[PDB]
Design a binder for this molecule. Structure first.
Ligand SMILES: [Cu+2]
Length: 97
């Protein structure tokens, strides 16, 4: 799967926003035009077993085109979002199955 942070003209949003995947799918968050971006997993809505720090990447990133891979493998739902661009409504969700 490929997620572009920052639409080409829609503004700052997780593109796609929410999407289901298979346990073993590679999810790459690629910066498109809204850096620096940040992705953190709401440890308040993450499965009671999958750490939210191993997938999250608090390490800010102002690189153009830079990306971060993530491969979840536990049928469920993980709620993530951008804390800095949260003022715009940048959120993320993945339903593994
Ligand atoms: Cu962001």
């Amino acid at each position: 799967a490929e997620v572009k942070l920052g639409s080409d003209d829609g503004g700052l949003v997780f593109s796609p926003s929410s999407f289901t995947v298979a346990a073993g799918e590679k999810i790459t968050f690629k910066n498109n035009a809204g850096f620096p971006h940040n992705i953190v997993f709401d440890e308040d809505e993450v499965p009671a077993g999958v750490n939210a720090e191993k997938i999250s990447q608090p390490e800010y990133l102002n690189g153009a085109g830079e990306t971060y891979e993530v491969t979840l493998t536990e049928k469920g739902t993980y709620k993530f979002y951008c804390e800095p661009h949260a003022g715009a409504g940048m959120k993320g969700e993945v339903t593994v199955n």
